[PDB]
Structure 1
């Protein structure tokens, strides 16, 4: 099964998923000097006031906080996006050490972790049909650095002990993802892919420039999760990030001058 180890990690994924070597793979390094301000980007709208979280799941590669996406509640609009994109789940990627863990990099800098808020384009009806489309998904990516604690993250941290191993889930209602956002919505955007198999090239990436700060204690609790299932030998869930992929025939646009 695909994973992050030596025998099944990112450098092996192309055998089962040949699109791994495709023309619009993610993540990428964001070269800040080459990214160009784009005055055609409309204001970005993150409208999470009515979000309904449901559950948190350890899927063996990360943990997902899942949302009720059965109507227009938590949505992303504006910026590079045509139309309305509905929040379905968020998850993180993180390292074994604070010096690595992000998937995107900024002038080759690796952050300690990266949050992905995953949204699907409502014109396609369901997530499954959206991932058959070149503009099916929008992922809002937010870097994490280690410093002061993020209060809005603590409820996530505290439930992780109950989903330690692959296949475990827990109720996770009334979680407000607004508490995971930095002050500024300045961003970079480019067309890319899912960063895990099946690596589908359906994503408009929107990567915020301002990281959030989380405490060492918070990220240390991420690193206590397990990739393995209950009763199997413990393999800590760390370094669940794909490295930067070739930019190829793409441009990264900036929302800010």
Structure 2
């Protein structure tokens, strides 16, 4: 099945998922000089004070931190969005080396990792319905650069030993995702897709301009995870990013001058 190896990686996905060659695929390169400032874009509203984290899972492709999305407890509104989007999970993409790992690029620059906070539009009632709609999902993307440690990440790093292999989960309550945000909420936005199969074209992307800093030791711990299940040959979970796709007939908008 699909993955990030030589024989099953991004360049092969189109055979099972023909939408891989579609008109609104993600990620993309953000060309800062051709993005257009749009004064009509509103500030983002991130309301995460009542978030309820539940569990952390190694799904064989990344690790997900899952939230209770049965009520409006952790929501995203404003920005380019109409309506209310509820947080369901976050996950990361990262590299084998500090000079790669992000999915989006900025003037062709790759960051060490990229955080995706995934939200679904409450008008569609459940996540599975929302992914079938062009405005179903809103994903907040945050870049990670290597430098100073991020204290609010450490609780995630320390539990990774307990979910080393595919299919393992652990209880993960009382985690506050506000400790992952940068100071500024200035952003770029464009219409795109999921970056893993099934690659559905259901996402409004909101990519923050300001990266967060994490330490070398924090990222090194991500690279100790395994793509494989327990008692199968070890293959390190690294380079779980899709490369940039053609922009086609899309414009990237900026919230800032």
The interval holding the TM-score normalised by the smaller chain is over 0.9
Q: How many residues align?
A: 257
Deviation at 1:43, TM superposition (A): 1.7
Structure-1-length-normalised TM-score: 1.00
Give the root-mean-square deviation of aligned CA atoms.
0.3
- Measure, in 1, the Cα distance between the counterparts of 2:48 and 2:219: 24
Distance 1:102 1:42 in 2: 26
Q: Could you tell me which residue of structure 2 aligns to residue 24 of structure 1?
A: 24
**Distance (Å, rounded) in 2 between the aligned partners of 1:24 and 1:249:** 8
Deviations 1:135-164 (A, max 9, x none): 000000000000000000000000000000
Aligned: 1:99 with 2:103: no
Query: Displacement, 1:169?
Result: 0.2
Q: Secondary structure at the match of 2:9?
A: coil
Aligned to 1:39: 39
Distance 1:32 1:125 in 2: 36
Match of 1:77 in 2: 77
Tell me the distance in 2 between the aligned counterparts of 1:208 and 1:151.
19
TM-score, normalised with respect to structure 2: 1.00
Cα offsets for 1:58-104 (capped at 9, x unmatched): 00000000000000010000010000000000000000000000000
Spell out, residue by residue over 1:103-132, the C-alpha distance to the aligned partner (whole angstroms, 9 max, x if none).
000000000000000000001000000001
In the aligned structure 2, how far is the partner of 1:233 from the partner of 1:64? 22
- Which secondary structure state, in structure 1, belongs to the residue aligned with residue 167 of structure 2? coil
Partner residue of 1:213?
A: 213
In structure 1, C-alpha distance between the alignment counterparts of 2:191 and 2:134, rounded to whole Å: 9
**How far apart are 1:40 and its partner, in Å?**
1.2
Verify: 1:153 aligned to 2:153, yes or no: yes
Aligned residue for 2:256?
Answer: 256
Stretch deviating more after TM superposition (40-49 or 199-208): 40-49
> Which consecutive aligned stretches of 4+ in structure 1 deviate over 6 angstroms post-superposition?
none
Structure 1 residue runs without a partner (length 5+): none
Deviations 1:27-59 (A, max 9, x none): 000000000101111121011000000000000
SS at match of 1:57: strand
2:222 and 2:43 map into 1 onto residues whose CA distance is 33
